Amino acid sequence: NKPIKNIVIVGGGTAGWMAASYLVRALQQQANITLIESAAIPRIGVGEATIPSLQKVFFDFLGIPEREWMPQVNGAFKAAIKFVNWRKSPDPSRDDHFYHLFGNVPNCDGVPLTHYWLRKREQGFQQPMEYACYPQPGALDGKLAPCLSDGTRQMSHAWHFDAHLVADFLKRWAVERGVNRVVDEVVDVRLNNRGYISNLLTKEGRTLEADLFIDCSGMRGLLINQALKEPFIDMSDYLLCDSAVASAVPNDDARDGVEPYTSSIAMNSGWTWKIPMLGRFGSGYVFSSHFTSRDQATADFLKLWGLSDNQPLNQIKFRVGRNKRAWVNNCVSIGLSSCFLEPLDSTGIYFIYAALYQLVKHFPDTSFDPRLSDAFNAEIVHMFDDCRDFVQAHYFTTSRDDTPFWLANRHDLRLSDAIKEKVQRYKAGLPLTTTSFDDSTYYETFDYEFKNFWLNGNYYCIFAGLGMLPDRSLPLLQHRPESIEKAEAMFASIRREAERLRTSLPTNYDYLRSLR
């Protein structure tokens, strides 16, 4: 069979230029690649927080180190997501916060530290789980960098960046390596009688043909949904939010510092993101229109940050779910045309490069063997649905009952069999999936991370954070007193490292300025 020669990508958002870059790199330029993007249709404007596989799976693949891309996109550091006012009905006299951290919780004689922490917690021990089991949370409270001043990394971290700058950076990289950029707008899609895309008609009269079409057209799904008619599985029975009101907000970095993490601040009818970088943070109130109007959500958002009635806003609506199939006939959807999940977990951009990695693993010839797309499709379903379930677990575990929105989350959601089973095992005292690798190995073995994406420590962070603990510590530990004492030694080490980091890390602000 003839190989794939001609590739057309529709869409010039983050997905489009990620796809163009990744395929320029993977197909050894043995490919004619054309990207078409409409001047009249703006990018979504958001997507600024990431996870550590962005470097390993995406940028390393292109041969671009952090030090090269970061300065060009207003890059900053992310060590965690901090959840504020999620656990209980909010009380301004109380500090309700917890971290969801990158990296893995150590094991002690085959048992995670989370489990030794719980046994202590049964006996009255008061310190929060993540402050016991990880050395960096206090450093994040102190707004400290993830590295020493000389660049040496001291904790696992990912990135914050400007959405527009990242796409433009990738545009320049791909165009310079022979991607053909067309500024025009696809107006019609022509299918043959067998249902494969034959060509695209544009607004300015071009007819585009290709062997492979990549749909990066955003939520409209021009090729995958509109032309090929693939069902979208709406999942508003699983998750309630459907809208966001978004803006960039100036920050007094010299007075206030730069938080080395994303915040998730729970609201009356959804939650607000905060994404610090030098000079400014991106922020957005993710909300449900069934519980609050866009007008009210806009008022709540402005009030939170003390913004003015004159401040222009990025008003977004969205549908939660994914296509029944990501790849149909000669068309692979990537990005918002494929699926969507609110950014509680910062996995939107992860879905782009994870799908691109998987497309290359299942790469077709011009005969489009359906066994390759079937196998690809099944990897996407598992990837999405597991993340969907992990996001939903924040919502059904909360104890908030102060509004109709939080009540509905407590009582009215549809839960998968898979999530119920995981919750069941947790409540019994069982660790969920654990790794014996260190952070570096885990963040370097994508076929492992891909299938083992959510680990014991991820679930513990969220569940213990929201104040839902197992019925019982692990029965085995009543037979293992020496292991319990060895775990105390490990808790003492973590505490020493926490103290060292306190007096050794530069502030995130100063470090960022030093980079530039």
Ligand X SMILES: Cc1cc2nc3c(=O)[nH]c(=O)nc-3n(C[C@H](O)[C@H](O)[C@H](O)COP(=O)(O)OP(=O)(O)OC[C@H]3O[C@@H](n4cnc5c(N)ncnc54)[C@H](O)[C@@H]3O)c2cc1C
Q: Which stretch binds Cl ion (CB under 5 A): 75-83, 314-322, 346-354, 401-409?
A: 346-354
Half-sphere exposure in the Cβ direction for 321 (13 Å, CA): 13
Task: Look at residues 448, 481, 471 and name the one whose alpha carbon lies nearest to residue 108.
Answer: 481
The smaller minimum CB distance to a copy of itself, of residues 140 and 356, is found at: 356
Q: Which does 428 bind (CB under 5 to 8 A by kind): ligand X, a copy of itself, Cl ion, none?
A: a copy of itself
Candidates 201, 372, 468, 484: give the one binding a copy of itself (CB under 8 A).
372
Q: Segment 5-44, which members bind a copy of itself (CB under 8 A)?
A: 26-28, 30-31
Residue 226 interacts with a copy of itself (CB under 8 A): yes or no? no
Q: Rounded to 10 degrees, what is the CA torsion of 377, 380, 385, 388? A: -140
Task: Give the Cα separation of 219 and 514 in Å (integer).
Answer: 39
Q: Is 270 exposed, middle or buried (0-12, 13-18, 19+ CB in 10 A)?
A: buried
Q: Which does 41 bind (CB under 5 to 8 A by kind): ligand X, a copy of itself, ligand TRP, none?
A: ligand X
Candidates 194, 479, 503, 516: give the one binding a copy of itself (CB under 8 A).
479
Task: Give the Cα separation of 257 and 341 in Å (integer).
Answer: 30
Q: Which helix (H) or strand (E) holds 32?
A: strand 32-37
Q: Which does 316 bind (CB under 5 to 8 A by kind): Cl ion, ligand X, ligand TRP, none?
A: ligand X
Half-sphere exposure in the Cβ direction for 372 (13 Å, CA): 16
Q: Considering the complex, what minimum distance in angstroms separates the CB of residue 464 from ligand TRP?
A: 14
Is the sign of the CA dihedral 385, 134, 463, 487 positive or negative? Answer: positive
Q: Considering the complex, what minimum distance in angstroms separates the CB of residue 248 from Cl ion?
A: 17
The smaller minimum CB distance to Cl ion, of residues 21 and 346, is found at: 346
Contacts of 225 (CB under 8 A, 6+ apart): 232, 323, 337
Interface pattern 389-428 for a copy of itself (x via CB under 8 A): -----------------------------------xx-xx
Task: Give the Cα separation of 107 and 109 in Å (integer).
Answer: 6
The smaller minimum CB distance to a copy of itself, of residues 28 and 93, is found at: 28
Q: How far apart are the first and last CA of the chain?
A: 51
**Interacting residue ranges for ligand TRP, rule: CB under 6 A:** 51-53, 81, 100-102, 345-347, 449, 453, 458
Respond yes or no: is residue 78 known to be catalytic: yes
Residue 57 interacts with a copy of itself (CB under 8 A): yes or no? no
Q: Considering the complex, what minimum distance in angstroms separates the CB of residue 337 from ligand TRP?
A: 22
Candidates 135, 221, 457, 465: give the one binding Cl ion (CB under 5 A).
457
Task: Look at residues 247, 344, 348, 239 and name the one whose alpha carbon lies nearest to residue 288.
Answer: 239
The smaller minimum CB distance to ligand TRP, of residues 281 and 459, is found at: 459
Helices (H), 217-307: 253-256, 294-305
Q: Considering the complex, what minimum distance in angstroms separates the CB of residue 353 from ligand X?
A: 10
Q: Which stretch binds Cl ion (CB under 5 A): 345-353, 409-417, 420-428, 501-509?
A: 345-353
The smaller minimum CB distance to ligand X, of residues 191 and 316, is found at: 316
The smaller minimum CB distance to a copy of itself, of residues 122 and 499, is found at: 122
Q: Is 483 exposed, middle or buried (0-12, 13-18, 19+ CB in 10 A)?
A: middle
Candidates 343, 364, 429, 431: give the one binding Cl ion (CB under 5 A).
343
327 beta partners: 332
Count CB-CB contacts under 10 A for residue 157: 23
Q: Considering the complex, what minimum distance in angstroms separates the CB of residue 482 from ligand X?
A: 31
Half-sphere exposure in the Cβ direction for 430 (13 Å, CA): 9
- Which regions of 123-194 does DSSP assign to beta strands (E)? 158-160, 180-183, 186-191
Q: Considering the complex, what minimum distance in angstroms separates the CB of residue 180 from Cl ion?
A: 30
Task: Look at residues 408, 416, 365, 364 and name the one whose alpha carbon lies nearest to residue 387.
Answer: 416
Q: Considering the complex, what minimum distance in angstroms separates the CB of residue 135 from ligand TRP?
A: 16
Cβ(471)–Cβ(428) under 8 Å? yes
Q: Considering the complex, what minimum distance in angstroms separates the CB of residue 186 from ligand X?
A: 4
The smaller minimum CB distance to ligand X, of residues 262 and 435, is found at: 262
The smaller minimum CB distance to ligand X, of residues 4 and 244, is found at: 244
Task: Look at residues 163, 166, 13, 143 and name the one whose alpha carbon lies nearest to residue 78.
Answer: 143
Candidates 127, 436, 493, 514: give the one binding a copy of itself (CB under 8 A).
436
Candidates 183, 407, 430, 489: give the one binding a copy of itself (CB under 8 A).
430
Q: Which does 457 bind (CB under 5 to 8 A by kind): ligand X, Cl ion, a copy of itself, none?
A: Cl ion
Residue 363 interacts with a copy of itself (CB under 8 A): yes or no? yes
Looking at 2, 78, 82, 324, which residue is catalytic? Answer: 78
| Lookup result for tokens 């609050």 | 292
Residue positions annotated with a catalytic role: 78
